[PDB]
Amino acid sequence: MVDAFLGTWKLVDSKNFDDYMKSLGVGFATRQVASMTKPTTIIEKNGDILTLKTHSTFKNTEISFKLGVEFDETTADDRKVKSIVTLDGGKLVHLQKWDGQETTLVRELIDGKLILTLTHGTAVCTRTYEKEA
Ligand SMILES: CCCCCCCC/C=C\CCCCCCCC(=O)O
Incomplete structure (x- = not known):
């Protein structure tokens, strides 16, 4: 189930993150810095x-969360959202809802890489993480 996602991951490719941030209303100065930032994501259970x-x-x-149980979340861009994370089709799917808006953060494993797809409005961003060596 979730075990292959666990560990420490580092960003190695980003496509359309600016589109995604812009769609969420993130200001230009934050987008600028974010476009040059490479996060480390740690997933533990x-x-x-x-x-x-x-x-x-x-930002940090x-x-x-418990899989399948809603939780409150305050995102990196300071949205206060209602969230749920589940396993769907082998993908770890994180849905955020606020003010009638929805965004998904979908993680999947392809050839050992973790691919994070972020969708809001029409914006679709694909970010790739690799396991810390
Ligand atoms: C915590 C670091 C997140 C990445 C840099 C800061 C981005 C701030 C602006 C928008 C936040 C959008 C929602 C979170 C995106 C996470 C992206 C990722 O985990 O790679």
């Missing part, structure tokens, strides 16, 4: 409680 840390030189976040 304790039982069915997962913890997902995103660390960087700019951490969430803990």
Whole structure:
């Protein structure tokens, strides 16, 4: 189930993240810095409680959740959202809802890489992470 996602991952490719940030209303100065930032994502579990840390030189976040159980979240860009993370088609699917808006953060493993697809509005961003050697 979730075990192949666990570990420490580093960003190695980003496509359309600016589109995604712009769609969310992120200001230009934050987008500028974010476009040059390479986060480390750490995914850990304790039982069915997962913890997902995103660390960087700019912003840091951490969430803990039970798979399939809604949780409150405050995102890196300061949105207060209602979230749920599940496993779907082998993908770790994180849905955020706020003010009637939806975004998904979908993680999948392809050839050992973790591919994070971020969708909001029409914007679709694909970011690739590799396991810390
Ligand atoms: C915590 C570091 C996140 C990446 C740099 C800061 C981005 C700030 C602006 C928009 C946040 C959008 C929602 C979170 C995107 C996470 C991307 C990722 O995990 O690679």
